[PDB]
């Protein structure tokens, strides 16, 4: 039936035509409508976001480094370290899971 091909394709062309428009127009719409009042929530993330992250990455940095610096003055640490963890390893040899994340990351 060709009136019936034609009639088809028409109006879904048509109908898809302005279907896209339409939640397109209107989705578009409400976001440069409601970015008015959300820019100050997005800005917030974004702040809050890399704040809080270099934040621990300054921080964690900084605690190892400033830990190195006032252990280093001391062999005590090392040899207390050193000494309870291999201690605890030769009494109870139980790190294969070292491997495994160590061929992971």
């Given at each position: 039936?060709?009136?019936?091909?034609?009639?088809?394709?028409?109006?879904?062309?048509?109908?898809?035509?302005?279907?896209?428009?339409?939640?397109?127009?209107?989705?578009?719409?409400?976001?440069?409508?409601?970015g008015?009042?959300?820019?100050?929530?997005?800005?917030?993330?974004?702040?809050?976001?890399?704040?809080?992250?270099?934040?621990?990455?300054?921080?964690?940095?900084?605690?190892?480094?400033?830990?190195?610096?006032?252990?280093?003055?001391?062999?005590?640490?090392v040899?207390?370290?050193l000494?309870?963890?291999?201690?605890?390893?030769?009494?109870?040899?139980?790190?294969?899971?070292?491997?495994?994340?160590?061929?992971?990351?």
């Amino acid at each position: 039936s060709l009136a019936l091909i034609w009639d088809d394709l028409r109006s879904l062309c048509l109908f898809s035509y302005h279907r896209l428009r339409d939640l397109l127009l209107i989705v578009t719409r409400i976001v440069e409508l409601l970015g008015r009042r959300g820019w100050e929530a997005l800005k917030y993330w974004w702040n809050l976001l890399q704040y809080w992250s270099q934040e621990l990455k300054n921080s964690a940095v900084n605690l190892l480094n400033a830990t190195a610096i006032a252990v280093a003055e001391g062999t005590d640490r090392v040899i207390e370290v050193l000494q309870a963890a291999y201690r605890a390893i030769r009494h109870i040899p139980r790190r294969i899971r070292q491997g495994l994340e160590r061929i992971l990351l």
